[PDB]
Structures are given as C-alpha cells and as structure tokens.
Amino acid sequence: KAGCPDNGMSEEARQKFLEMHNSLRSSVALGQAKDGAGGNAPKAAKMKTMAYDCEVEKTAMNNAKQCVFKHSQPNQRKGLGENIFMSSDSGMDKAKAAEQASKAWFGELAEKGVGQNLKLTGGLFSRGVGHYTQMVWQETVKLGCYVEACSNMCYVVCQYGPAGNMMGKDIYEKGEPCSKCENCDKEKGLCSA
Numbered sequence: 351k352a353g354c355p356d357n358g359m360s361e362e363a364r365q366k367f368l369e370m371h372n373s374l375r376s377s378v379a380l381g382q383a384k385d386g387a388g389g390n391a392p393k394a395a396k397m398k399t400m401a402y403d404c405e406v407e408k409t410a411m412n413n414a415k416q417c418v419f420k421h422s423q424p425n426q427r428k429g430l431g432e433n434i435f436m437s438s439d440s441g442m443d444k445a446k447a448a449e450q451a452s453k454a455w456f457g458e459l460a461e462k463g464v465g466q467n468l469k470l471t472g473g474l475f476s477r478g479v480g481h482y483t484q485m486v487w488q489e490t491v492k493l494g495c496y497v498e499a500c501s502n503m504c505y506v507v508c509q510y511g512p513a514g515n516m517m518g519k520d521i522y523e524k525g526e527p528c529s530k531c532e533n534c535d536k537e538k539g540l541c542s543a
C-alpha cells in the first residue's frame with residue numbers, strides 16, 4: 351500500500367486505487383455486481399485480494415508521464431496488464447482521478463455486459479470489456495498506478511501484476527465466495543495469501 355517514493359503520486363491516490371479495486375472485486379465475488387448482459391456477474395470462489403506495488407507503479411508512471419493517451423507495448427511493462435483513462439479536467443485531484451478511472455473501467459461490466467461465461471474468448475475480448483476484466487482478474491494481485499497532469503488531460507495509468515486478460519483463460523473461478531480459499535471472509539469474498 352505504501353513505502354512508495356515521493357514521485358508525484360500521492361499516498362491518498364494510491365490508497366484510493368487499491369481500495370476501489372479491492373472493493374469492486376469484493377462486490378463481484380459476492381454476486382452483487384450488476385451485469386449489463388442481465389442479472390449480476392457470477393459469484394467468485396477465490397477472488398484474490400490485491401496489494402499495492404511500488405514497482406508496478408513505476409512502469410505505470412513511464413506510460414503516464416508521456417502524456418499521450420495510449421497503451422504501452424508489453425515489453426515496457428513486462429509481465430503486467432494495463433488500464434488507461436483520461437479526463438479533460440487536467441488538474442483533477444489525484445484521488446478523484448483514481449476514483450473516476452476505477453469507476454470507468456469497472457463500468458464496462460454494467461454498460462457493455464459480460465455474462466455468465468467467464469472464459470476470455472476472442473468474442474468476449476473484442477467487446478471492449480477488457481478494463482473491467484483486468485480489474486477483476488482472479489490471479490492479478492499487484493496494482494500500481496500513476497496520475498499525470500498533462501497540458502490538455504489528466505492521464506491515469508494502472509498496471510497489473512500477473513497480467514490478466516490471457517486469451518482462453520477464465521477471468522475468475524465461479525463458485526460461492528471463499529469456497530476455494532482459506533483466508534477469506536464470506537461477507538467480503540476476498541482471499542488473502
């Protein structure tokens with residue numbers, strides 16, 4: 351969560367990023383997340399808790415500080431996934447940007463729909479739900495993000511340790527919350543190491 355350098359990113363913003371991610375992963379794991387394809391997203395049997403990672407934030411920073419809205423190429427973030435977001439409000443509070451970015455990515459579920467088949471098929475990936483799927487990717491347990499105030503945008507980049515969005519793999523295992531992990535509160539649905 352912390353022990354990160356004084357590099358332009360604030361503790362408040364890191365906190366918000368992590369809290370939003372774990373909170374939203376919990377909502378999904380508990381069967382409480384509204385799915386645009388109908389009903390709610392399926393309950394998750396072993397949705398893993400995320401931790402904040404300063405090293406992942408550094409590579410997210412490398413993208414953000416370029417002030418060009420685009421995905422970085424894989425080898426500029428070796429082994430990591432990535433979500434990107436922008437707002438025209440360039441001087442936005444960094445925690446506010448974290449909240450807005452996290453909501454925009456997660457919103458893909460409610461807006462575009464995913465459905466009850468969580469295998470990441472070519473069909474599913476091409477529908478543009480890939481920011482959401484990375485946020486709730488079961489095996490992704492490291493989060494690191496950077497918010498950069500650019501000339502004409504606030505630019506937010508999050509990166510994700512173990513990369514998610516592996517084609518042909520399930521986003522997460524379906525089952526009752528905590529049913530396939532030990533360190534997990536049935537009312538939260540998040541598995542700790």
Ligand SMILES: [Zn+2]
Nearest residue numbers: 421433434480
């Ligand atoms: Zn994207």
